[PDB]
Amino acid sequence: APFVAPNVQGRVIKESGYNTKTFKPAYVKPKHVIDPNMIIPRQPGEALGTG
Amino acid sequence: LDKGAGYQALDYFPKMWDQEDPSVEYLMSQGAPLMVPADPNASFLLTVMS
Numbered sequence: 001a002p003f004v005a006p007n008v009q010g011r012v013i014k015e016s017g018y019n020t021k022t023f024k025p026a027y028v029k030p031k032h033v034i035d036p037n038m039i040i041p042r043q044p045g046e047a048l049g050t051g
Numbered sequence: 052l053d054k055g056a057g058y059q060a061l062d063y064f065p066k067m068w069d070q071e072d073p074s075v076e077y078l079m080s081q082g083a084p085l086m087v088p089a090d091p092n093a094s095f096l097l098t099v100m101s
Contacts, residue, residue: 036052039058040052
């Protein structure tokens with residue numbers, strides 16, 4: 001607090017305000033194409049020979 | 052080799068789908084044929100003309 005000789009008025013004290021933060025979320029979009037070149041070939045569980 | 056009928060093996064598969072605008076239908080039948088002689092030597096071919 002300010003020391004102020006009691007013979008005088010007093011001292012005016014300043015203030016401070018405040019702030020805000022604002023954010024937009026980002027966007028994510030992966031995809032696969034699944035044409036036959038991927039469906040046909042033998043997958044690991046398939047028996048050798050026939051499948 | 053079609054998502055229709057679960058890729059299963061068929062003599063032929065009739066398939067039909069439409070385009071929304073203009074309203075055009077497409078109609079396709081597809082099949083995977085081969086005629087195999089079990090004994091390719093049970094027959095012969097003779098060319099007789101010149």
